[PDB]
Amino acid sequence: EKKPAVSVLTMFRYAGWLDRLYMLVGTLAAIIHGVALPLMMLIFGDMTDSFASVGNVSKNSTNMSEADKRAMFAKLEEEMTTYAYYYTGIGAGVLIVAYIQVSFWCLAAGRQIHKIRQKFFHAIMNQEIGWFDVHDVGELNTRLTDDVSKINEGIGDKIGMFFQAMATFFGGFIIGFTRGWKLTLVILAISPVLGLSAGIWAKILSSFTDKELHAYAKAGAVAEEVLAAIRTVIAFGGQKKELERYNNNLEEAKRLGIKKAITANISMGAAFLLIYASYALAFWYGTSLVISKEYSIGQVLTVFFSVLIGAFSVGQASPNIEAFANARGAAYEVFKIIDNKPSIDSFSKSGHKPDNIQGNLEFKNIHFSYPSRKEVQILKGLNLKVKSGQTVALVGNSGCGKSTTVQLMQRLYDPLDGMVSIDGQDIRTINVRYLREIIGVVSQEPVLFATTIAENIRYGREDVTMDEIEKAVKEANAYDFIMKLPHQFDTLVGERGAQLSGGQKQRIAIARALVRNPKILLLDQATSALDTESEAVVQAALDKAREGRTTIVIAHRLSTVRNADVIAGFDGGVIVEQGNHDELMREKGIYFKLVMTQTDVPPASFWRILKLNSTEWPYFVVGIFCAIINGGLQPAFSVIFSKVVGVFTNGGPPETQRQNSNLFSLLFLILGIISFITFFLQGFTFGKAGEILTKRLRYMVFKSMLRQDVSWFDDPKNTTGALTTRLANDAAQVKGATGSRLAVIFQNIANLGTGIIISLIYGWQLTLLLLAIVPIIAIAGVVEMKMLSGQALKDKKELEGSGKIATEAIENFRTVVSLTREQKFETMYAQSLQIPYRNAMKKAHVFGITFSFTQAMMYFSYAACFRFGAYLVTQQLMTFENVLLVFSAIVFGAMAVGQVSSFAPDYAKATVSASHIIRIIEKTPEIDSYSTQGLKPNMLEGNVQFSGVVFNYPTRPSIPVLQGLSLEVKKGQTLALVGSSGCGKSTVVQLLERFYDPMAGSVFLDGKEIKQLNVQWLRAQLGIVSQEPILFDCSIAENIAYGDNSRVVSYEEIVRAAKEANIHQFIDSLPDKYNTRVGDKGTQLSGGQKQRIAIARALVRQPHILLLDQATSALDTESEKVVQEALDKAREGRTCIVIAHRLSTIQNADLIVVIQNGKVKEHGTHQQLLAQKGIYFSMVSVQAG
């Protein structure tokens, strides 16, 4: 894939003349900061030149014993004063400059973002309604804060950091050439091999990356299927059969993960070799040029570093480019919306605004097709008039085009052909806001906004008084119930507040329209979702609302329409018939046909996690030794680098300056080789140690997950997705807290430990300065990581309130356009952004300082060392070689632990990722399905008995469900459970399945308490038939055979089960009869046919109990009767408990139980409970209507 982007010059629109100034000044700062370090290398060379000019004089030949001390040392004391005044001068200039760099760029970005948010949100509120039809709203809402966040990255400080790095790239290669061009051109001849070597691996590391996500996608698809279907898994006890499927597809991503683990460390050691190799080749050649008195030692050390600084400056500007390019990419999708102009402008002020509107409506030859499918036409040549004050009712079948009428009259769409007119004037010639202000809509499903009732009404009109709210509420028949609410009119409604009934919400929606006082009223299926009781009060409110207004209603439920003035019957976008109720009933057309049919913070320890990888201890031993060696190469380099410069800066005969240097020069390749080996071995032992640990933990987890009982899967935290996540990536991230953490610690110890030792003996005074400053500079890098993340939470949390407003407006956009309150949410959006704006303008002031005080404390400490270290050479207390042997042992070694710790996986994220694993493993359930003990008798009777069971769902222990529920079920007969809502009938199936235990009471099977039986054997002789049957992506034969696990199951056994389920006849005509793959790829079976499979699945087990829980939850009229044939067949000679909602099934049952509030109110046969004239008699009386 390749996504488009914006031109550079476009993207920086919305940048006023002040914003254009900050970026320019911010650059000139960034340029200075970029060159600031090259000058430190240039001075560093001139520093060693002063030391080298005397380093060999005073040693070989002794002119005087103490009159020569002053001679050479008073020369250095005057030369080293300037080099020290120079070093502090940079850190002072950095402190100023580094502030300007970050401050001015983040400021110019902030002023632009604030304009973008408002310009982008207003752009969305201005779009057409056909525009919302095509686009996915979910991405759009995230696009308001994700793409906007993506632009903010690539126009803030990240540009300042780019011009800083490029000012070093040119600033570095400049001083290299101008102080000595031969040695640089050597290095620039090998660096293409390094830029080549780096890119080739990133192509192979991205190769072994994307090969991995599609490798676990096979396993993770099994994880997502099971943990969503866990109720069927536990019910049929396939908790070991799903483990093998998940495991057999789990070794692929292990062997593949090693090919990354090897290659990932080759790419390091290969590129790390080429550093040490390019080190020798530049030092071997750089030393040959000082022997001949062409260069000094200062010239080599400047040019060699200043190239590597300027060369490594590329890699420091790579992500800052990608952020700027990602910012252009995200800015394209945004700026498209701002510059997109609609034909139906809800903000324009063009058309007329006619007063004293009578409401004469007309439709003239309307042809319309929704923008999703132009090819199909909904309306074709539709003509219709509506006289002022009259009510017209539109009726028809499906695909008729009724709801289009409401949507064309608000002008949410423009008709292709024809003309919609109000009072003889075309609708397209009047102003849109005034049009929708003179119209009130009453949609099918009523919407309420997360505010008070008063604000919900004030969205009808912002300037309404509280007296007018009371009147409009009274007219809507909503007053008396509002006064019964706790906080009267200030009661908080919406998603956030108390839930109101459906009939109550729609009456509020009326009051919004009534406040507008419209001349036209539109009702789009206003009472479809409401029941018979709530509809009656609303119709009185609507009939009141219609008085003196022209009205068009999209009417279902035809009885409400009989008193209407005129009816219109639709067939294929055309009105076929029109007249009064009596006329169309007489016509015996379309309308007559319709009327007559009606009438997360756990604490895991480091030692616990490490024990998980204990079964591969030999891999850990090698990685420790190997980690020590690579940790030893860093202080080794400090010697070999110092021993080189020690030759030409302490004194020696030119007879030995060749073999010493060439030795030390080729000792870098020795370090370079050993680097390549230790990386090739670090990722071969700790690498496999991590990829084994992933596979073994994903198995242990998914094993332990299925062990858990149902109350665990009932939790809100343990959702099927959050468990697949926990099983997918969290299971693998543990390895960053086992062997990787030992590779770190042994490398950090072997480096900084042995580096501390050496520097202490070679110079005990200077180290106490540096090892006192290293803690200071390391802390500063941490506090920036803190305040960068602690501020990331603060700003991103202040923005959700702004985002809640937007989310409320996008998710209900069709509403707000009808209320014409686009401007309101715009202001509400802007008012919410006033807080993060004024906060972010001081954020740049902060991060300007924290960036300056980090860089300045480094350059000042660079001067505090080479000032104090110079004082140690003047007093003859240490050699300049020992300075570099101290400095490049502590500093370059203290930098090494960061380059290590920053390369390894996130240890904090790894430990918490591991603590979640251990809980999921070490958790044993109240009901161990994997257990083996239990009575498990040879008694095949089937006497069920509940005795006073008391149960509360542990997810909600406050509510009760069952209180003293007792009931028996004799062998072979049927028991039916019925009741109102929240009675507890479905709990019986789950307690006999033993998904949960009861708090008190007991459940017996064949006179034996089920808590003593084996759980698998209990569920074995129970045949569950769930409401919505879960079918797995597999063939018919395997899905049915899943019922009875651990059986040979041959061809002969399969067909008998499908026969008795009444699918054999339907199957035999299907393509490839019983081998037909079922799932998303294969044939889609109807809801009734799926249930017969779940019945067939239960029949193969041959259980002596059958639980039927709300089966037949569908309207498949033909397939319905087929299911009941199969259901009656299964119950004939088995103990049966039925969760009854259909009144036809229960009449022939042997016994019935009416439950209410966990108590049996009455029980008996059908005829007895009918003659009881109690609760059960009330239920049968309802169907007589």
In eight-state DSSP terms, residue 1026 is -
Q: Does 1007 appear as a known binding residue? A: no
Backbone phi, psi, residue 1035, to 5°: -70, 170
Can residue 198 be called a binding residue for Hg ion (CB under 5 A)? no
- Asked whether the beta carbons of 1149 and 976 are under 8 A apart, the reply is yes
Q: Does 979 appear as a known binding residue? A: yes
In eight-state DSSP terms, residue 430 is B
Toward Hg ion, which CB reaches closer, 564 or 626? 626
Q: Does 981 appear as a known binding residue? A: yes
Toward Hg ion, which CB reaches closer, 176 or 979? 979
Q: Does 401 appear as a known binding residue? A: yes
Distance CA 741, CA 737 (A): 5
Can residue 464 be called a binding residue for Hg ion (CB under 5 A)? no
In whole angstroms, the minimum distance from the beta carbon of 825 to Hg ion comes to: 28
Distance CA 531, CA 400 (A): 25
Residue from the set 504, 678, 1021, 1089 that interacts with Hg ion by CB under 5 A: 678
Can residue 331 be called a binding residue for Hg ion (CB under 5 A)? no
User: Which residues inside 371-410 make contact with Hg ion, applying CB under 5 A?
Assistant: 400, 402
Q: Does 980 appear as a known binding residue? A: yes
Instruction: Tokens for 814, please give them.
Output: 């069709």
Residue from the set 464, 609, 865, 1078 that interacts with Hg ion by CB under 5 A: 865
Can residue 684 be called a binding residue for Hg ion (CB under 5 A)? no
Q: Does 396 appear as a known binding residue? A: yes
Residue 70 C-beta-side C-alpha neighbours within 13 Å: 2
In whole angstroms, the minimum distance from the beta carbon of 1037 to Hg ion comes to: 10
Distance CA 402, CA 393 (A): 10
Can residue 682 be called a binding residue for Hg ion (CB under 5 A)? yes
**Residue 181: C-alpha distances to residues 34, 299, 300, 1029 (Å):** 21, 10, 10, 79
Instruction: Tokens for 275, please give them.
Output: 């550093």
Tell me which residue has its CB nearest to Hg ion.
1034
Can residue 236 be called a binding residue for Hg ion (CB under 5 A)? no
Distance CA 47, CA 101 (A): 29
In whole angstroms, the minimum distance from the beta carbon of 468 to Hg ion comes to: 36
User: Which residues inside 1132-1171 make contact with Hg ion, applying CB under 5 A?
Assistant: 1136
Question: For strand 1151-1156 and strand 1159-1164, is the pairing parallel, antiparallel, or unpaired?
Answer: antiparallel
Toward Hg ion, which CB reaches closer, 11 or 469? 11
Determine the 3-state secondary structure of 870 from DSSP. Answer: helix
Can residue 573 be called a binding residue for Hg ion (CB under 5 A)? no
Q: Which stretch binds Hg ion (CB under 5 A): 591-599, 814-822, 823-831, 1125-1133?
A: 1125-1133
User: Which residues inside 406-435 make contact with Hg ion, applying CB under 5 A?
Assistant: none
Residue from the set 127, 477, 560, 630 that interacts with Hg ion by CB under 5 A: 630
Instruction: Tokens for 1046, please give them.
Output: 């651990």
Backbone phi, psi, residue 129, to 5°: -90, -30
Q: Give the contacts of 316 (CB within 8 A, at least 6 positions apart).
A: 161, 165
Q: Does 1178 appear as a known binding residue? A: no
C-alpha dihedral over 366, 372, 374, 375, to 10 degrees?
-120
Determine the 3-state secondary structure of 966 from DSSP. Answer: strand
Q: Does 403 appear as a known binding residue? A: yes
Residue from the set 111, 516, 985, 1092 that interacts with Hg ion by CB under 5 A: 985
In whole angstroms, the minimum distance from the beta carbon of 721 to Hg ion comes to: 21
Distance CA 649, CA 297 (A): 8
Beta bridge pairs of residue 968? 945
Q: Does 399 appear as a known binding residue? A: yes
Q: Which stretch binds Hg ion (CB under 5 A): 490-498, 509-517, 682-690, 751-759?
A: 682-690
Angle at 718 between CA 608 and CA 1139, to 5 degrees: 140
Toward Hg ion, which CB reaches closer, 814 or 1131? 1131
Toward Hg ion, which CB reaches closer, 678 or 913? 678
Distance CA 351, CA 361 (A): 18
Toward Hg ion, which CB reaches closer, 518 or 569? 569
Q: How many residues bind Hg ion (CB under 5 A)?
A: 22
Can residue 569 be called a binding residue for Hg ion (CB under 5 A)? no
Can residue 320 be called a binding residue for Hg ion (CB under 5 A)? no
Site string for Hg ion, 106-145 (x = CB under 5 A): x---------------------------------------
Residue from the set 291, 419, 1034, 1175 that interacts with Hg ion by CB under 5 A: 1034
Residue from the set 34, 156, 848, 893 that interacts with Hg ion by CB under 5 A: 156
Q: Could you identify the residue written with the tokens 């035999």?
A: 1068
Toward Hg ion, which CB reaches closer, 249 or 974? 974
- Asked whether the beta carbons of 518 and 437 are under 8 A apart, the reply is yes
Can residue 241 be called a binding residue for Hg ion (CB under 5 A)? no
Q: Which stretch binds Hg ion (CB under 5 A): 133-141, 629-637, 802-810, 924-932?
A: 629-637
Toward Hg ion, which CB reaches closer, 872 or 920? 872
User: Which residues inside 993-1032 make contact with Hg ion, applying CB under 5 A?
Assistant: 1032
Toward Hg ion, which CB reaches closer, 15 or 186? 15
Q: Which stretch binds Hg ion (CB under 5 A): 72-80, 170-178, 217-225, 1128-1136?
A: 1128-1136
Q: Could you identify the residue written with the tokens 């009661």?
A: 491
Can residue 869 be called a binding residue for Hg ion (CB under 5 A)? yes
Angle at 937 between CA 936 and CA 939, to 5 degrees: 135
Distance CA 835, CA 826 (A): 16
C-alpha dihedral over 1010, 1016, 1020, 1021, to 10 degrees?
-10
Distance CA 83, CA 46 (A): 8
Q: Which stretch binds Hg ion (CB under 5 A): 79-87, 593-601, 678-686, 806-814?
A: 678-686
How much of the chain is helix, strand and coil, in % rounded to 5?
65, 10, 25
Distance CA 1030, CA 1053 (A): 22
CB atoms within 10 A of CB 654: 9
Site string for Hg ion, 883-912 (x = CB under 5 A): ----x-------------------------
Strand order in the sheet with 425-426: 379-386, 361-368, 417-422, 425-426
Residues at the binding site are 396-403, 979-986
Residues at the binding site for ATP are 396-403, 979-986
**Residue ranges binding Hg ion (CB under 5 A):** 106, 156-157, 400, 402, 626-627, 630, 678, 682, 865-866, 869, 887, 974, 979, 983, 985, 1032, 1034, 1131, 1136
